[PDB]
Design a protein around this ligand. Structure first.
Ligand SMILES: ON/C=C1\N=CCN1CCCCCCCN1CC=N/C1=C\NO
Ligand SMILES: ON/C=C1\N=CCN1CCCCCCCN1CC=N/C1=C\NO
Ligand SMILES: *[C@@H]1O[C@H](CO)[C@@H](O)[C@H](O)[C@H]1NC(C)=O
Ligand SMILES: *[C@@H]1O[C@H](CO)[C@@H](O)[C@H](O)[C@H]1NC(C)=O
Ligand SMILES: *[C@@H]1O[C@H](CO)[C@@H](O)[C@H](O)[C@H]1NC(C)=O
Ligand SMILES: *[C@@H]1O[C@H](CO)[C@@H](O)[C@H](O)[C@H]1NC(C)=O
Lengths: 532, 532
C-alpha cells in the first residue's frame, strides 16, 4: 500500500489528501521522541521506543504547551499563528508530505517553525506542506519542538534541566529524518533544513553546533539568524531567569534539585502564566526562555565560532522582510494600534527606542535616536512611526542576519540573499505595518495557488517562483535553473555582496543590503556601549 | 577744506579718491593707539597722545607683524590675503572712507579683518571700502589689531602680557570711532561692526564682552562666531603655549617676568618663525595665539554667557559659505593639491578626520567617520573629498555659528541668516574647493562693480543686493527696504529658523540650516566625548 510505510521505529499508516485538483500522501503525527512528561520535563529528549503494529498517522498531533494570543479574538491575522490543535506536553511529533506516486530518492525539505522560542506549531494552515510537496515534487517534513520554559529552561551544571532541550528536540527529528526518510522516498543525503524567525535562528544554530551538522545538507534561513540578540542568553542569565521563574511560583530555591522538582509539579499553564515576569528589562522583541551558550551545543561564543569558521560549510539561502519590526511595536509599544495609522509623537518615539534597545545606556539611546531622526521634520508622525519600525527590524533581524551572512560567506560554499518586500493584497493587518514579520511564509508554502484565499494572479506567480527557488536550491545548492531563460539570482560574494528583491515586479539586483544602518548596529553602537 | 577734519586727537588731512567714475574722500592710516613697541609689546593698548599740526592721512599704514603665505608665489588666490604693505609692530591705525560731499550724520560701518588671529591687514584690495561707501552712502571704517603672539600671548595673572590685547586694540578703535566719527559725518549712535572669520568671531566677542557693548549699535558676522573651537583657549592652555614659545626661543622660563623680558628682546620674525610649534595637536583649523577666557574680557565661559543671556541685545545679520573647509584641507591635509581634483582615498579621508577633529578619542573619530561616509560607495574619491570638506566646515564654522544664532535669538531683537553659495566666475582656485572661506567678502565690498576684475553682470547685481542688504541693515536693523517690491529676507525666529540663500538666482527661503549635521556636532559628539 502507498499509505503504508515501514520504518526503523515501526509501521506507519498515512492518509491521502487532496491538493490543487490532485492527490498526495500525508503522514501526520509521527513520534520521533518519547513523551517528555512527568520527571522527563526539562530533560533531554529520549528516542521513541519502537512500536509493534501500525501507527495511525492520518491526523495532526498535539501542539506543544504555549502562550495563546488573545489580543484580537476572532481576528485571523493573530489567530493564524495560535495553536490549532489541543495543547499537550506530549507533542514531539513530525509530519511528512509525500508526492504520489511515491518517489524513490528525492529532495527533502524540513521545516522548523518560528514563534520566539515561546510558541509555535507544525500544524498551522500556513505551514501546510502539501502544496510545496506537490508542485515541486519534494518530500516535505515539518518537525516540532518544546517551546517556552518546557523547551528552554536552563540551569547549567544540572542534568535534569541543562537548557537547549528544544534545540535537541529538533536535532532528534533531523536524526529520525536521516535514519528513516528513505522509506518515504526521500534522499537522506539531500535534506534542506529551513525555518523562519526563531526557526531561522534554529537553522543557523544547527549550522554552528558540531552535534547537528552531519544531519543535513543545505540550509534556508528566513528572517532570523543564530546571532540575533533575542535568540540566545548566557548561562548566568539563563540561571537567573529559571530561579526567578521559581520565585514567581513560590518554589523552594535552596538548590537546583529543589527548584526543578517544584517546577515539574506545576501544571503547564502555571508556568505559562508567569513566564514573561522573568525578563530583566522593559522590552520588546525579547523572550524569556531561549537557547543558552552552554559550552556543549555551542562550544564557544557564537561570534568567535563565526570568526574562526567553526561551522558547517555548505550552501545557504537566506533573507529578510521589509518591515520586520511592526508586529512587535503593535503589541508592545505606546502609540501603536491595530485600527489606526499609528502616527507616533516624539515622546512615543523616544519611549519606543528605549523599549526597543533594552541593553543601551543614555548615550546609546541618543545614538540610535540621532541615526533614525529626520531633524528637519522631527514631528512627522509617519516618519517617527516608520523610523521606529526600521529600528526594531534592523536591530533584531536584518543587521544580525547581515553580520551572519558576511561572516559565513568567507568560509561557505555559496550564498544567496533576498529582500522580500511584497505586501499581500488580502492581508488583514493595517497598512502601516507593511511587509510584516512572517508573511513571506504563505508564499513559500504556496497558499496563493488556492483560489479561495483570494490572492491575485501575480501573487500566484510570485509564489511559484519562490517555491521553485527554494526547491531548486534544496536540490542543487542553486535556486537557479541551469540553462534557463529566466533572469539569474546572483551569488552573494564577499566583494560584491549582491542580493535580489523578491516581489511581483521584474527581478532587480542590488548590493550591500542596508549597509548604512547595519554598520551602525554591528560596528559603531557595540563600540560605544563597550566604552561607556 | 573737505579733506581737512579736526578730531579730538588733532587735525587730519585726507585724500580724494576715484570711485566708479566719481570721487569720495579717504582718510588712511589714522592712529588710534600709541605704538606698541619695545616694553609695550604684549601690553594693553594705550590711547594715542594728541598731536599738534596736521596728520598726513593720504596713504595706507603699515600692516601688523605676521606670517606670510609663500605656498604659491605669484598666485593671486593666496597673495590677495598677504600683507600688501611693509610690516611693523607700529601698526595700530584705522582707515575711513567718507562720501562726497561730506555727510552730516550718516550710518557707520566698521570692518574687522579675519586671518585666524595670526594674520590679516586692513589695507587689502578686497577690503577697499570706497565702493561700499560710495554706493550706499555710508561712512566705512576699517580698523587694525595686533595678531599672533604680539596680539594674543597670554600669561594670566601678569599685567605685562595679560592676553586679549588684540581684542582691546579693536575696542580702542571702536572707542575712537565712538568719540570722533561725528567729525567725518558719521553717526556715532548708528555704528555697525562687521567682520569675517576671526573678524566675525571678534564681532561676536564684542557682543559678549561687557566692556565692548556700548561702543556699537548692530553687528554683522561672516563665517565666524565667538564660540568657534578655534577662536579661544583656556587660561592654562594660553599659559602653556606662551611658555612653550619661550622654550622654542631659548628663554629663561623661571618666571613670567623672565619669559616676557626674553620675548620682548626677540625680533618680530623670530616669534613668527616658531609660532606654529606650540600647537598641542597635529591639526588643521587651529591657531596658536587666540583670545583667552580670562575672567575679565569674558566674565564667565562663553556657553554660560550665551545661556543666561549675558550679552548685548540688538539686531544681528550673519551667515556662512557653502564650502568653508576647503582652504584648510588644501594647506594641511594629505591628498589635497591646488592643481588636481584632489580625489581622496579612505586612508587619506581617515587621516583627514583625525587632523580635523584634534580633541577627539577613537570612538569620537569613529562617530564622525560614520556620520559622513556613504557606506554604499565608500571608495568614491569625490564623496570622500566633499565629505571631508563638509566635516571641516561644519565643525569649525557652520555648527558653531548655528549654535550661537539659536542661543542669541532667545534674547536678541532681530536675527537675519544667510547661506552664501555662489561660486565666482573669475576665481583662480580649483573647482573642487567650491565656495571658499572668505570669498563672499569681495561681493560685500563691491568688487564686481569694477569691470577690470572680470565679473559677470549677474555677479555685479548680486554684489549690489548684498551691499544694500548690509547697509540697510546697518541703517535700520533690517536688510529689507520698508515698502519695496523686492522679495523679503525673512526674520530668523526660534520657531521657524528661516534663512535665505545668497546667490545670483531668485531668492529662496529655507529652514533649519544644516540641522542634521549640527545636532551631531552640537548635541551628540560633545556628550560622547564627555562620557569617554
Ligand atoms: O509567555 N509567552 C508570551 C507572553 N507572555 C505574556 C505575554 N506574552 C508576550 C507575547 C508578546 C511577544 C510579541 C509577539 C507579537 N507578534 C510578533 C510576532 N508575532 C506576534 C504575534 N503573534 O500572534
Ligand atoms: O605662524 N602663523 C602661521 C603659520 N605658521 C606656520 C605655518 N603657518 C600656518 C598657516 C596655515 C593656516 C591655514 C590657512 C590656510 N588658508 C585658510 C584660510 N586662509 C588660508 C590661506 N590664506 O593665504
Ligand atoms: C485513525 O483515526 C481517525 C480519527 O481519529 C479514524 O476515523 C480512522 O478510522 C483511524 N483509522 C484507523 C485506526 O485505521
Ligand atoms: C564549492 O566547492 C566546490 C568543491 O569543493 C568548488 O569547486 C566551488 O568553487 C565552490 N563554490 C563556491 C561558490 O565557493
Ligand atoms: C603725504 O604723503 C605723500 C607720500 O608720502 C606725499 O607725496 C604728499 O606730498 C604728502 N602730503 C603732504 C605732507 O601734504
Ligand atoms: C525689538 O524691540 C522692540 C522695542 O523694545 C520691540 O517692540 C520689537 O518687537 C522687537 N523686535 C523683535 C524682532 O524682537
Amino acid at each position: 500500500s502507498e499509505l503504508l510505510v515501514n520504518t526503523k521505529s515501526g509501521k506507519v499508516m498515512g492518509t491521502r489528501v487532496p491538493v490543487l485538483s490532485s492527490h498526495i500522501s500525508a503522514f501526520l503525527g509521527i513520534p520521533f521522541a518519547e513523551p517528555p512528561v512527568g520527571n522527563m520535563r526539562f530533560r533531554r529528549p529520549e528516542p521513541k521506543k519502537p512500536w509493534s503494529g501500525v501507527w495511525n498517522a492520518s491526523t495532526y498531533p498535539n501542539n506543544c504547551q504555549q502562550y495563546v494570543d488573545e489580543q484580537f479574538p476572532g481576528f485571523s491575522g493573530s489567530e493564524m499563528w495560535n495553536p490549532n490543535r489541543e495543547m499537550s506536553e506530549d507533542c514531539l511529533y513530525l509530519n511528512i508530505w509525500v508526492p504520489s506516486p511515491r518517489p524513490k530518492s528525492t529532495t527533502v525539505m524540513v521545516w522548523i517553525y518560528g514563534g520566539g522560542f515561546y510558541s509555535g506549531s507544525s500544524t498551522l494552515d500556513v505551514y501546510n506542506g502539501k502544496y510545496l510537496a506537490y508542485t515541486e515534487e519534494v518530500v516535505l517534513v515539518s518537525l516540532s519542538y518544546r517551546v517556552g520554559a518546557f523547551g528552554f529552561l536552563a540551569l547549567h551544571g544540572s542534568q535534569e534541566a541543562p537548557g537547549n532541550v528544544g534545540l535537541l528536540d529538533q536535532r532528534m527529528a533531523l536524526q529520525w529524518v536521516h535514519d528513516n526518510i528513505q522509506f518515504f522516498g526521500g534522499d537522506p543525503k539531500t535534506v534542506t533544513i529551513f525555518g523562519e524567525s526563531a526557526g531561522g535562528a534554529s537553522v543557523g544554530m544547527h549550522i554552528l553546533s558540531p552535534g547537528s551538522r552531519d544531519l543535513f545538507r543545505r540550509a534556508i534561513l528566513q528572517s532570523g539568524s543564530p546571532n540575533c540578540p533575542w535568540a540566545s542568553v548566557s548561562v548566568a542569565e539563563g540561571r537567573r531567569r529559571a530561579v526567578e521563574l521559581g520565585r514567581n511560583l513560590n518554589c523552594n530555591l535552596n538548590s537546583d534539585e529543589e527548584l526543578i522538582h517544584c517546577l515539574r509539579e506545576k501544571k503547564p499553564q502555571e508556568l505559562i502564566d508567569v513566564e514573561w515576569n522573568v525578563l530583566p528589562f522593559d522590552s520588546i522583541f525579547r523572550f524569556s526562555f531561549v537557547p543558552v551558550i552552554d559550552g556543549e551545543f555551542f562550544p564557544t561564543s557564537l561570534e568567535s565560532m563565526l570568526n574562526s569558521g567553526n561551522f558547517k560549510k555548505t550552501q545557504i539561502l537566506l533573507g529578510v522582510n521589509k518591515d520586520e519590526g511592526s508586529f512587535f511595536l503593535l503589541y508592545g509599544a505606546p502609540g501603536f494600534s491595530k485600527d489606526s495609522e499609528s502616527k507616533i509623537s516624539r515622546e512615543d518615539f523616544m519611549s519606543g527606542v528605549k523599549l526597543s534597545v533594552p541593553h543601551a545606556n543614555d548615550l546609546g539611546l541618543d545614538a540610535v535616536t540621532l541615526q533614525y531622526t529626520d531633524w528637519m521634520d522631527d514631528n512627522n508622525g509617519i516618519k517617527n512611526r516608520d523610523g521606529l519600525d526600521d529600528i526594531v527590524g534592523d536591530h533584531n533581524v536584518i543587521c544580525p542576519l547581515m553580520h551572519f551572512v558576511n561572516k559565513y560567506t568567507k568560509f561557505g560554499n555559496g550564498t544567496y540573499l533576498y529582500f522580500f518586500n511584497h505586501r499581500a493584497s488580502n492581508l488583514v493587518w493595517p497598512e502601516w505595518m507593511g511587509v510584516i514579520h512572517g508573511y513571506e511564509i504563505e508564499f513559500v508554502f504556496g497558499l496563493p495557488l488556492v483560489k479561495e484565499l483570494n490572492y491575485t494572479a501575480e501573487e500566484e506567480a510570485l509564489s511559484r517562483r519562490i517555491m521553485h527557488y527554494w526547491a531548486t536550491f534544496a536540490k542543487t545548492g542553486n535556486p537557479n535553473e541551469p540553462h534557463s531563460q529566466e533572469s539569474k539570482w546572483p551569488l552573494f560574494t564577499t566583494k560584491e555582496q549582491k542580493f535580489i528583491d523578491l516581489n511581483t515586479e521584474p527581478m532587480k539586483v542590488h548590493q550591500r543590503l542596508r549597509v548604512q544602518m547595519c554598520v551602525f548596529w554591528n560596528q559603531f553602537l557595540p563600540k560605544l556601549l563597550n566604552a561607556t
